[PDB]
């Protein structure tokens, strides 16, 4: 038992990742198979980034300029192209060590594992949810860029997130694997805004069932609820409405623990009601949006890869 | 910006997990070089570990007993031997993804990352701290015992904590790699007691640098303490004692923010007595001990391995 906020082992992603220097900026890139990918704001100066015309300032780039270091190697770089906000470094060398992979787009409320990386070396793992708002919270410094956020799936890494940049309050933005922003952001130095961030409800639901799972009961009452009559309770409480596709999904953790989801949704509309009276829960004083419910029975019952 | 609970890389100590069988019990064990390290129990039945003679239970094994496999490959047994509560399994084959490692013991207030496994097989990754009381705050199942706590400096893995056994209310033991437990405990199911944890100080002060390091100021106040009379007020509170050598450590935070480290003992007396007033730290409502200040360092200037 025990409950951490747990990532995926990062290995098989670790040994994809290499340093992309254009000029005098220096970032991370993606290696599978013969391609490098990474953001297109390495072909800037801080200058640029101000307000760059990325189409304009790539025609000036040929191959020789862009250095890909594998480590202690550097990769020679074949053909180049841009894709939305990232570029394609085509390689004269298939990396040997690229997994199974797909490249994914999330949803808002899932989560994934990212690994930070400085000059093409792993820094350090950790767990993010995409944020309603399309941001996630992250921990980025410059130079990280490129880094990457993933699940795995027994053998197959799904790649879900490249970093571009960060936003007021420690916030993060950055694309799918195709260069697509998450969010209503552009890879620009000049003002922007995310839009209000939301409580990710079913992943409060499957963060109290892990509760219950272990051991921590205290917070739950004997009612139940309507499924219409909880959401006109937490949308005060800037809670996402809660749907029927939810309670399915939430179906696997209320079959092994015995509570209704109506019935934990009950227990949640005290919680938001009433507080916590100073209690915690899986030692936590505030309500936990972090865990999906496939990470709740992931954890509990000890999937691996 | 922004400040996660990281853990470190752990594709170097992905690549020694292996699983290990006798009889009907399988658990996880590190293999490095020719060297396969796992718990002793593994040589147990369930009834056995009620009460066991592992020297007795050893004796009537022979290398043969012994079932390793690395992936999907049987490694041979060619020795075996039981120092404390390990047992070091030699193989005839040396592992070639064993990385530069050292084995050292750790001290309480020390922090390391847990590489869970199952079968043989990484589960996830997470940030743990040896508690004062030498106990570890994990997340750990069945056939979880052999999954390896770890650190990494450049490119050397430290290993430190090989996970053995779980403690009422989820809490978790274990030895070093030379198989000596931290803390007063045997691996035998009967009854035995955990001493009173207590709060890291100096855990408490480097997240309180994190926290200005990220903007989050409001809890700094405008006094000083002195080193006895801190110490006095954080007793009653089952804080450690903050000694000289902690304040020494604290050095490189205290440089880089501006603030005396004896300055942030006198915020941190504050918090102790007066409570939070419904505020939070770092996106958090109670005050975090398990970021070492090397932790913080390694995390806001981006340390890579
Ligand atoms: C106003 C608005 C909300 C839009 N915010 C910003 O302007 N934000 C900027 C930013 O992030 N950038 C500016 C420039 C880069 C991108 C960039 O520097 N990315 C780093 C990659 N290595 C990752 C950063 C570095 C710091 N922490 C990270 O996460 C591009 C092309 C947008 C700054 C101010 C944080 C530098
Ligand atoms: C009373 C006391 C405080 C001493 N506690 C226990 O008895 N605790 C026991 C326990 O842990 N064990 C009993 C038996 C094993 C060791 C063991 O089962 N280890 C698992 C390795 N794969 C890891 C466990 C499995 C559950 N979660 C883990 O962490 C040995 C030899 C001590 C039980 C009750 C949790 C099973």
Redesign the interface.
């Known amino acids: 038992?025990?409950?951490?906020?747990?990532?995926?082992?990062?290995?098989?992603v670790?040994?994809c990742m290499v340093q992309v220097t254009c000029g005098t900026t220096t970032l991370n890139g993606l290696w599978l198979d013969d391609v490098v990918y990474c953001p297109r704001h390495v072909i800037c100066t801080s200058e640029d980034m101000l307000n760059p015309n990325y189409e304009d300032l790539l025609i000036r780039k040929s191959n020789h300029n862009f250095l890909v270091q594998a480590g202690n190697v550097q990769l020679r770089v074949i053909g180049h192209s841009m894709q939305n906000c990232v570029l394609k470094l085509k390689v004269d060398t298939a990396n040997p060590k690229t997994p199974k992979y797909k490249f994914v787009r999330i949803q808002p409320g899932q989560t994934f594992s990212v690994?930070?990386?400085?000059?093409g070396?792993?820094?350090?793992?950790?767990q993010?949810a995409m944020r309603p708002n399309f941001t996630i919270?992250?921990?980025?410094?410059?130079?990280?860029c490129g880094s990457v956020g993933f699940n795995i799936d027994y053998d197959c890494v799904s790649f879900c997130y490249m970093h571009h940049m960060?936003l007021p309050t420690?916030?993060?933005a950055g694309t799918d694997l195709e260069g697509n922003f998450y969010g209503p952001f552009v890879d620009r130095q000049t003002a922007q805004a995310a839009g209000t961030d939301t409580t990710i409800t079913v992943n409060v639901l499957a963060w109290l069932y892990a509760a219950v799972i272990?051991?921590d009961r205290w917070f739950l009452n004997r009612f139940t609820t309507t499924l219409n009559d909880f959401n006109l309770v937490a949308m005060k409480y800037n809670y996402e409405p809660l749907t029927q596709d939810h309670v399915d999904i939430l179906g696997p953790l209320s079959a092994q623990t015995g509570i209704a989801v109506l019935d934990m949704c009950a227990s949640l509309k005290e919680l938001l009601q009433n507080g916590m009276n100073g209690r915690?829960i899986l030692?936590?004083?505030?309500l936990e949006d972090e865990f999906t419910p496939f990470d709740v029975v992931?954890?509990?019952?000890?999937?691996?890869?």
């Open positions: 038992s025990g409950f951490r906020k747990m990532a995926f082992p990062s290995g098989k670790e040994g690994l930070a990386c400085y000059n070396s792993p820094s350090g793992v950790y993010c919270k992250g921990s980025f410094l410059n130079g990280s960060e420690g916030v993060h272990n051991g915690t030692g936590s004083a505030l992931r954890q509990c019952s000890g999937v691996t890869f």
